Amino acid sequence: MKVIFLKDVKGKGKKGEIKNVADGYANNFLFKQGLAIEATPANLKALEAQKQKEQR
């Protein structure tokens, strides 16, 4: 369960940072609450697209 922490945690996770936490922790704490989400293309993309500004 790669994990996109949407916010930082106890000095471990970081804003929308994608890394796998405890493959199950990911969905049993960060996802079911408000720390991260199941790293998935559906979302992972937005994390980068959200960083699009004026370069085209």
UniProtKB/Swiss-Prot annotation:
Highest taxon in the source lineage: Bacteria
Similarity comment text for this entry: Belongs to the bacterial ribosomal protein bL9 family.
Role of this protein: Binds to the 23S rRNA.
Protein's name in the database: Large ribosomal subunit protein bL9
Origin organism lineage: Bacteria, Bacillati, Bacillota, Bacilli, Bacillales
Residues of the full protein shown: 1 to 56 of 149
